[PDB]
Amino acid sequence: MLTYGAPFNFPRWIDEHAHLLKPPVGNRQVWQDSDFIVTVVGGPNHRTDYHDDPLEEFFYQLRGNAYLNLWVDGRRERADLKEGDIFLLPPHVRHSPQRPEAGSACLVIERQRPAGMLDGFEWYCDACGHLVHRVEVQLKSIVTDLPPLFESFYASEDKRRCPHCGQVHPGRAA
Ligand SMILES: O=C(O)c1ccccc1O
Ligand SMILES: [Fe+3]
Ligand SMILES: [Fe+3]
C-alpha cells in the first residue's frame, strides 16, 4: 500500500498549514513515522543554540530568506539561504538557523536517527566564546523530546554560566 499516501500539491499544502508554520508552533512534519524526516520550517523564529547532527541535513529555501550561524575551523561563520537557494549540511557541523522573515518557508530533510546515534545541542559564550553548555540526546520525537531540554537551560542561570569568563548566557534571545 501507499503508506505515505499519494502525491499532493505542495504550494497549497503549505498555505493550508501556514497557521502552524508561524510560532508558537514554527514547523510541520509532512509524513509521520518515516525514515526521511521531511519538514517545512517557517519564520519568524530566532534561536540561540547549535545543533550538532550526526548525519546530513538538506535545505531548500522555497520562500523568503533565512540563515545559519555556524562554527568553522574555530571561527563563527554564516550560511545564507536567500530564496531559491539549496544547501547540504555535512554531519556534526554546528548550526543555528535564524528565520527572521514572517511567512518564509524552507524545506528541511533528514533521516530518522537509529538507536546509538545521538544529537548534541550546544550554547556558546556570547563574550568569551567558550562552550557554555552541551546536551546529547537520542532524538525520537522532535515534539516531546526537544522543548523540555530548552526550558531546563533557559530557566537556569546556573547552566548558562560560562566555565571561562563566568558570564551568564541569556537563553531567551538577543
Ligand atoms: O534538528 C534539525 O535537524 C533542524 C531542523 C530544522 C532547522 C534547524 C535544525 O537544526
Ligand atoms: Fe539541525
Ligand atoms: Fe565566556
Swiss-Prot record:
Query: Which family does the UniProt entry place this protein in?
Result: Belongs to the 3-HAO family.
The UniProt function text for this chain reads: Catalyzes the oxidative ring opening of 3-hydroxyanthranilate to 2-amino-3-carboxymuconate semialdehyde, which spontaneously cyclizes to quinolinate.
Q: Which cofactor(s) are needed, names only?
A: Fe(2+)
Source domain of life: Bacteria
* Lineage per the UniProt record: Bacteria, Pseudomonadati, Pseudomonadota, Betaproteobacteria, Burkholderiales
Annotated disulfide bonds: none
**Name of a matching Pfam family:** 3-HAO
Q: What is the effect of changing R99A?
A: Increases KM for 3-hydroxyanthranilate 40-fold. Decreases activity 5000-fold
Question: What are the EC numbers?
Answer: 1.13.11.6
The yes or no answer to whether the keyword Hydrolase is present is: no
Annotated positions binding Fe cation 2: C125, C128, C162, C165
**What keywords are annotated for this sequence in UniProt?**
Dioxygenase, Iron, Metal-binding, Oxidoreductase, Plasmid, Pyridine nucleotide biosynthesis
Gene symbol here is nbaC
* Protein name, UniProt field: 3-hydroxyanthranilate 3,4-dioxygenase
Q: Where does substrate bind?
A: E57, R99, E110
Q: Which residues form a coiled coil?
A: none
Instruction: Describe how the cofactor binds.
Output: Binds 2 Fe(2+) ions per subunit.
